[PDB]
Amino acid sequence: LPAHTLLNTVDVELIYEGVKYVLKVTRQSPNSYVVIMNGSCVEVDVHRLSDGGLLLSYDGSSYTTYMKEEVDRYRITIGNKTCVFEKEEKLHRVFHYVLDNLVNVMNGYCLPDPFFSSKVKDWVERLMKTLRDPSLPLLELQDIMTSVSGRIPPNVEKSIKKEMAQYASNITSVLCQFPSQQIANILDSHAATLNRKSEREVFFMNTQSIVQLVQRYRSGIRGHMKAVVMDLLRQYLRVETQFQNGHYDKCVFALREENKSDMNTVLNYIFSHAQVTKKNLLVTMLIDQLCGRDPTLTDELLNILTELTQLSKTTNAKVALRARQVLIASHLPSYELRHNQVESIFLSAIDMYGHQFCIENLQKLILSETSIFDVLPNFFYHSNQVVRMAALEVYVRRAYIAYELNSVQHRQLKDNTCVVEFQFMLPTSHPQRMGGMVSFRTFEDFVRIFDEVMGCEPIHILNVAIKTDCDIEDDRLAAMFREFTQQNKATLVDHGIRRLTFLVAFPKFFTFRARDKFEEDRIYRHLEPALAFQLELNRMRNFDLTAIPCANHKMHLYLGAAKVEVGTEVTDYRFFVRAIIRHSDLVTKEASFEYLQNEGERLLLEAMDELEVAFNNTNVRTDCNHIFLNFVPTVIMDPSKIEESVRSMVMRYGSRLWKLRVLQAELKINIRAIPIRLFLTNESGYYLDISLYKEVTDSRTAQIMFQAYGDKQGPLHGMLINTPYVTKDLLQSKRFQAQSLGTTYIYDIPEMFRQSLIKLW
Amino acid sequence: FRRKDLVKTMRRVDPVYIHLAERLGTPELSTAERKELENKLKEREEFLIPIYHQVAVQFADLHDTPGRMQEKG
């Protein structure tokens, strides 16, 4: 039978004196009932009586109740009264309370739809807070020890008392953990002594609760906290792993064949599977509290996640996808490492510079592939006021990687305003540039001495960074800067400054051109002006781009509208995703797959979410959405293994990419470094067409050429490096296809009809 | 299943074809070695056609069964 008839909810309609009451009755357990009446819920403890009645606990008072069903009446007897309806707290009790309620949810006993998730989130939060509270195992120890005053040797009891007294006296303090091991040690020592003849049996029997407590907390309060939620996820898998690898009928038949001696087990499986969606909501909430702000995974969590992500049945996709996120999420930097290393290098060089090691440290900061732009903008003074120049030189030297930098100079004004001037050029692009950078505080020193700090074709590039460390709000900051740039036109009338870059201290970049155009840029916002080349965004030459705002401003989503003449309108619209992966060069010891896979998959999932939101909220009818991921760090790996990795990464979400009309993808990876380009065509989610090319720089010019690996050269063999796109996307591509077959395009039928009528008339 | 799909399927089954194709796709061998491997690959491609044609016919035969007509209704 299908799993939508074994339902746990009943609608009951009772009319009393002309007033119809529509009530819903479901259960949180075999004996715990939930009744919705007049929009409000009441929980009742109901026990079945052998005489056909019920024992109810409703408002603290007990009731013994009976029902008699008539032709058109419900006669409810409570005590000795009749109603005829017409037919049309201590922190360790909380742990058990909320855990039992959550387990009941996992077993299919859920609250009604209008009331579900109103209480479960609180049960999860209270379970987390209780489990993380250090005083919980002390209360469990007190409860097991108080109920056994005797039958325990005084030695182990005194040792346990001392250790728990210490732990109690060290509650909520660094360097404090529950002494489970010391209790285990004294009990195991007494067991090792092994006193005979009723010292043995009584000791081994009457200490089992303490052994169980230390076993539960063998890994500490945090380990126990994680273990409980892991047990709940194991309860989820216990049921759901039986409904995979086939159809519902196969599962039910196999369960009947495995459990011949009991059919209640099969019914339990079906019942708990019926409410899998509510189970999935709780599973998502449970996963969030297990592997959230803790980027690490053990060899036990990984097994649960690996099994959970393999629930290929679509009804559990919500829990699989989030689990996949965790597997990629817990391999990221925590910003403490970069902050400490970069800040130590920047501050330690200031006391006296030129010791022949701080130079190499600054050089390492400049020449590293890992982004440090989340730490650099905060070096305004920090205490020292020289670090200004040390920051100003590094950031530019870190950002201007495609430029030939030939001179750097430090200058100061007669204030606390340090400036660094730079002179650089482009070897084989746009055939001498100059620029400089200054930092200020909070706003005012920027505008107060704007014309003075400027004194370093519009070849000059001017960058400014201001200490406003609060609240990523693009509109407020852009208006604050734009109001000044709309009045002061020194950038045009002084000597000519191509662009003014406003860096808000993680960094927010607002580029302005106060020379001819309105001082705003929605397209290159949040990008470095020096690394604006390292996005492959200038390839959209035949599109008018509209940038799509989003949270977490590391992803860049654009909607390009194909350029057309003043006649025919735009029909080709395309969403383009451009993201950069920042990390240091990898050392391959058969352990370089995790970095590429996790970073690419994270950016892919974020891209799909933003594409879904952007696409569904508009109506432009895009056809070929495209994703480009730039893998900055060098990796030593055979391209065939990178093909396997991207094949898995893309195929596991091919169904979503098909639903979102994502048809092409490009992945650039630096091998050993020589870049390779993976060109992926991803149509309906059964097959992924991967073509591999290398970038060939062995030419007499700055031109780069694609070269394939012999097998399946494909269309890009001999294609240059960087070409625009556009197509006709419908209506002037189907007309041709139809004319090629000797027939007209279908939407030409009405016009001929009209024209034929004219001849008829 | 045109000839090219039969060859694509051969690419992942036939050990001889796999050996030759993995060798030809290996860089920095020589010109003459690549030419010899290419000619041997062409010979295997045209040689193996009947067996993989039979296999593809079986593959298409598998989806014409009454089980599918039952599942679809």
Residue found by looking up tokens 């959230």 in the block: A292
Contact residues on chain A for B27, CB-CB shorter than 8 A? 709
- Backbone region of residue B40 per phi and psi (left: phi > 0; alpha: psi in -120 to 50; beta: other values): alpha
**Residue A12 near residue A23, CB atoms below 8 Å:** yes
Residue found by looking up tokens 């939060």 in the block: A125
User: A549 - beta bridge partners?
Assistant: none
**Residue A323 near residue A309, CB atoms below 8 Å:** yes
Encoded tokens for A612: 């879904």
Whole-number Å distance between alpha carbons of A513 and A519? 5
Contact residues on chain A for B21, CB-CB shorter than 8 A? 711
Residue found by looking up tokens 């007897």 in the block: A77
**At residue A682, what are phi and psi to the nearest 5 degrees?**
-125, 90
Which residue on chain A is closest to B24 by alpha carbon? A710
Whole-number Å distance between alpha carbons of A365 and A347? 13
Residue found by looking up tokens 């760090």 in the block: A633
Contact residues on chain A for B25, CB-CB shorter than 8 A? 709-711
Whole-number Å distance between alpha carbons of A40 and A112? 11
For residue A296, give the nearest of A580, A594, A555, A554 by alpha carbon.
Answer: A594
Whole-number Å distance between alpha carbons of A410 and A91? 62
Contact residues on chain B for A709, CB-CB shorter than 8 A? 25, 27
Which residue on chain A is closest to B4 by alpha carbon? A712
**Residue A307 near residue A329, CB atoms below 8 Å:** no
Residue found by looking up tokens 């031109």 in the block: A703
Cα A378 to Cα A83, A196, A396, A437, B49, distances in angstroms:
74, 70, 15, 15, 68
**At residue A525, what are phi and psi to the nearest 5 degrees?**
-65, 145
Best residue of A688, A689, A711 to probe chain B, by most B CBs closer than 10 Å = A711
Interchain contact B66–A (C-beta under 8 A): no
Whole-number Å distance between alpha carbons of A30 and A503? 62
Q: Which helix (H) or strand (E) holds A511?
A: strand A508-512
User: A274 - beta bridge partners?
Assistant: none
- Backbone region of residue A385 per phi and psi (left: phi > 0; alpha: psi in -120 to 50; beta: other values): left
Cα A217 to Cα A158, A175, A212, A293, distances in angstroms:
20, 17, 9, 22
Contact residues on chain B for A710, CB-CB shorter than 8 A? 24-25
Q: Show the DSSP H helices in A309-457 as ranges.
A: 317-329, 336-348, 358-367, 387-399, 444-448, 450-453
Does the annotation place B2 within a ligand binding site? yes
Whole-number Å distance between alpha carbons of A374 and A372? 5
Q: Which helix (H) or strand (E) holds A146?
A: helix A136-146
Which residue on chain B is closest to A638 by alpha carbon? B26
Which residue on chain B is closest to A249 by alpha carbon? B71
Question: In three state form, how does the secondary structure of A661-704 look?
Answer: CEEEEEEEEEECCEEEEEEEEECCCCCEEEEEEEEECCCCCCCC
For residue A92, give the nearest of A143, A167, A166, A160 by alpha carbon.
Answer: A143
Whole-number Å distance between alpha carbons of A250 and A237? 18
Neighbouring C-beta atoms of residue A381, cutoff 10 Å: 15
Encoded tokens for A225: 């906290």
A interface with B, Cβ–Cβ < 8 A, is 709-711
Contact residues on chain B for A711, CB-CB shorter than 8 A? 21, 25
Q: Which helix (H) or strand (E) holds A616?
A: helix A593-616
Whole-number Å distance between alpha carbons of A99 and B25? 59
* 3-state SS class at A651: helix
A590 Cβ contact partners less than 8 Å away, ≥ 6 residues apart: none
Burial class of residue A310, CB neighbours in 10 A (0-12, 13-18, 19+): middle
* 3-state SS class at A81: strand
Helices and strands in chain B: count of H runs, count of E runs: 5, 0
User: A12 - beta bridge partners?
Assistant: A23
Cα B46 to Cα A589, B49, B50, B52, distances in angstroms:
42, 6, 9, 11
B24–A710 CB contact, under 8 Å: yes
**At residue A307, what are phi and psi to the nearest 5 degrees?**
-70, -35
Burial class of residue A249, CB neighbours in 10 A (0-12, 13-18, 19+): exposed
A711–B25 CB contact, under 8 Å: yes
**Residue A115 near residue A41, CB atoms below 8 Å:** yes
For residue A279, give the nearest of A247, A246, A311, A302 by alpha carbon.
Answer: A311
Residue found by looking up tokens 């479901």 in the block: A26
**Residue A372 near residue A342, CB atoms below 8 Å:** yes
Question: What is the DSSP-derived secondary structure letter of residue A381?
Answer: -
Q: Which helix (H) or strand (E) holds A611?
A: helix A593-616
B21–A711 CB contact, under 8 Å: yes
Encoded tokens for A578: 């451009």
Interchain contact B10–A (C-beta under 8 A): no
A81-88 long-range contacts, CB within 8 A, separation 24+: A83/A16, A85/A14, A85/A15, A85/A16, A86/A14, A86/A15, A86/A16, A87/A15, A88/A13, A88/A15, A88/A20
Chain A / chain B CB contacts < 8 angstroms: 6
Report strand pairing: A625-635 vs A573-581.
parallel
Question: What is the DSSP-derived secondary structure letter of residue A115?
Answer: T
Q: How far is A220 from chain B (nearest CA, A)?
A: 51
Side chain identity, residue A625: N
| CA-based end-to-end distance of chain B | 28
Residue found by looking up tokens 């050993």 in the block: A672
Interchain contact B56–A (C-beta under 8 A): no
User: A423 - beta bridge partners?
Assistant: A407, A434
Q: How far is A730 from chain B (nearest CA, A)?
A: 29
Encoded tokens for A415: 């204030």
Taken in order A670, A671, A673, A677, the sign of the CA dihedral is: negative
Side chain identity, residue A473: E
Angle at which helix A301-308 crosses helix A220-240, to 10 degrees, equals: 30
**At residue A125, what are phi and psi to the nearest 5 degrees?**
-65, -40
Instruction: Go through A476-493 and write b for each residue having 16 or more CB atoms within 10 A of its CB, e for each that does not.
Output: ebbebbbebbeeeebbee
Q: How far is A709 from chain B (nearest CA, A)?
A: 7
Q: How far is A607 from chain B (nearest CA, A)?
A: 32
To one decimal place, what's the resolution in Å?
A: 2.6
A709–B27 CB contact, under 8 Å: yes
Encoded tokens for A348: 């330690």
One DSSP character per residue, A1-61 reads --TTSS-S-EEEEEEETTEEEEEEEEESSSSEEEEEETTEEEEEEEEE-TTS-EEEESSSS
Q: How far is B24 from chain A (nearest CA, A)?
A: 8
| Helix, strand, coil percentages in chain B from 3-state DSSP, rounded to 5 | 75, 0, 25
Angle at which helix A264-274 crosses helix A248-258, to 10 degrees, equals: 150
User: A466 - beta bridge partners?
Assistant: A440, A504
Instruction: Go through A722-733 and write b for each residue having 16 or more CB atoms within 10 A of its CB, e for each that does not.
Output: eeebbeebeeee
Instruction: Go through A81-110 and write b for each residue having 16 or more CB atoms within 10 A of its CB, e for each that does not.
Output: eeeebeeeeeebebbeebbebbebbbbbbb
Side chain identity, residue A487: Q
Contact residues on chain A for B24, CB-CB shorter than 8 A? 710
| Helix, strand, coil percentages in chain A from 3-state DSSP, rounded to 5 | 40, 20, 40
A711–B27 CB contact, under 8 Å: no
Cα A360 to Cα A67, A280, A354, A395, B59, distances in angstroms:
88, 52, 10, 16, 65
**Residue A160 near residue A183, CB atoms below 8 Å:** yes
**Residue A623 near residue A572, CB atoms below 8 Å:** yes
Order of strands across the sheet that contains A433-441: A404-412, A418-425, A433-441, A460-467, A497-504, A508-512
Whole-number Å distance between alpha carbons of A167 and A182? 11
Instruction: Go through B13-31 and write b for each residue having 16 or more CB atoms within 10 A of its CB, e for each that does not.
Output: ebeebeebbeebeeeeeee
Interchain contact B67–A (C-beta under 8 A): no
Q: Establish how many alpha carbons lie within 13 A of residue A654's alpha carbon, considering only the half-sphere containing its beta carbon.
A: 17
Order of strands across the sheet that contains A688-696: A543-548, A556-562, A573-581, A625-635, A662-671, A674-682, A688-696, A705-708
Interchain contact B27–A (C-beta under 8 A): yes
Whole-number Å distance between alpha carbons of A606 and A550? 10
**Residue A105 near residue A29, CB atoms below 8 Å:** no
Interchain contact B30–A (C-beta under 8 A): no
Burial class of residue A750, CB neighbours in 10 A (0-12, 13-18, 19+): exposed
Angle at which helix A276-288 crosses helix A220-240, to 10 degrees, equals: 160
Encoded tokens for A680: 């992926």
**At residue A110, what are phi and psi to the nearest 5 degrees?**
-120, 155
Contact residues on chain A for B35, CB-CB shorter than 8 A? none
